[PDB]
């Protein structure tokens, strides 16, 4: 199952100044970029057009080009409409796309955040506020819901265009999506808030896809103190992760770091301290 996410970030500093920047993700791989500075959407993969014809893509891009200009003016007008309730600066974020399921099933979404809080979604045939949203948004919602033309376009984008487009992306991008890249590991140590303790670190870098297993071990004994950090990105669309273990000084000998990953084909990495 793959989640396709179009992420829009719009900054409005005052009545005049604004910028909108967008990035598009299929799972954890970037497929598009659209800088405020660019008239056109940029492909970040050879296969980013999916299975759309040039005419289909040009038409879709045109719709987005009109959207970006229109969106900018609409926010500026909505600010005037709610004045002086809401003032600049304002950040608006959109997360739109679809989650793809086996055998023609999918679910689409369009979520909107205002000053970093999820307040609005498109659902069914209209815009609605979500639980916890402030009441003043009822007027913007009323105004947005008066626009039958936007409602029809969004319904089509979410219900039809998104799943169809992504199905083609998954076919076109298969070899990248299914790539296997091997982890490389290395060990190191530091002192950590310690009377006489140390912190061993097992570094694992360059693996794809994300799922990985990293454990400190003495023989066959999985050391339960193993703390694995967050998954951190490398610039080459691989992943980095480190697993730490807080141990007593002069008790490092015997410890090893074991790494299991789909790319290794059963041949685990074992690094002895």
């Amino acid at each position, epitope marked *: 199952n793959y989640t396709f996410r179009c992420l829009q970030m719009s900054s409005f500093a005052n009545r005049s100044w604004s910028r909108t920047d967008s990035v598009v993700w299929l799972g954890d791989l970037q497929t598009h970029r659209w800088s405020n500075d660019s008239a056109t959407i940029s492909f970040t993969k050879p296969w980013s057009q999916g299975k759309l014809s040039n005419q289909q893509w040009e038409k879709l891009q045109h719709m987005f080009q009109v959207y970006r200009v229109s969106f900018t003016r609409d926010i500026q007008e909505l600010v005037k409409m709610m004045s002086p309730k809401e003032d600049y600066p304002i950040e608006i974020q959109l997360s739109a796309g679809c989650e793809m399921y086996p055998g023609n099933a999918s679910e689409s979404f369009l979520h909107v955040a205002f000053q970093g809080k999820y307040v609005v979604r498109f659902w069914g045939t209209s815009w609605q506020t979500v639980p916890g949203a402030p009441s003043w948004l009822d007027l913007p919602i009323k105004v947005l819901n*008066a626009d039958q033309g*936007t409602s029809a376009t969004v319904q089509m984008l979410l219900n039809d265009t998104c799943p169809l487009f992504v199905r083609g992306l998954l076919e076109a991008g298969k070899s990248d999506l299914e790539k296997q890249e091997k982890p490389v590991a290395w060990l190191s140590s530091v002192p950590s808030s310690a009377h006489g303790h140390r912190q061993l670190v097992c570094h694992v870098s360059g693996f794809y896809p994300k799922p990985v297993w990293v454990m400190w071990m003495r023989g066959d004994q999985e050391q339960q103190g193993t703390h694995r950090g967050d998954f951190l990105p490398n610039a080459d669309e691989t992943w980095y992760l480190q697993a730490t273990l807080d141990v007593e000084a002069g008790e490092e000998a015997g410890l090893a770091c074991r790494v299991k990953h789909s790319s290794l084909g059963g041949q685990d990495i074992i690094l002895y301290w």
Partner: T-cell receptor
Amino acid sequence: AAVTQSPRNKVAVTGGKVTLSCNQTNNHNNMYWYRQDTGHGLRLIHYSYGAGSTEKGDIPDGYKASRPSQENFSLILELATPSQTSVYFCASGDEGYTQYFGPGTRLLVLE
Amino acid sequence: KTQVEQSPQSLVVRQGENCVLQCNYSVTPDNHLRWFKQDTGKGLVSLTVLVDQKDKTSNGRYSATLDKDAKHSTLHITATLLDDTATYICVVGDRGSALGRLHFGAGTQLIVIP
């Protein structure tokens, strides 16, 4: 949805103060002032999204707008000039795109 | 010069003749297009509003077309009467809500000889 304007006709002198008034009982949030001049389409001067709101349109210079209530939207020419000789139209609307226009006001500013 | 252009600027027809009025625009986006009739020194009377990509409307002797791809509309008046003597104004609304701006043509003056 009806809209009224007063006065319907006005002769003024350069440097004098002129107030054009528009009234609507539709409970419309939104009101709009335009002028119509020969060789041009109607051009937006000022508009308002509710009591206390006034916003500049395309050609706001030399005009002040006033929205004291939901019902009333005024266009104020503090220092009238001959260039403001025109036909002025007010409109109102709700959240929908339709603007409901008043019957117009003819203003002549003499030297 | 402007985003909405009307043609002809003016025309003279005899009673009972048909005529066709043109509106061409560059406005983007184009949510809807309305035709107004304005009698001399009077107000704006809506004749029709066109909303679809390829639209046709009618209202008595008035009929209109809109082609949003060509950004072109025509107003047809069948069997003109003296009372059709007026200015006819094309206006494009750029939104399907109050967030829209109206873009007005400068009008076509029709005189009908009785």
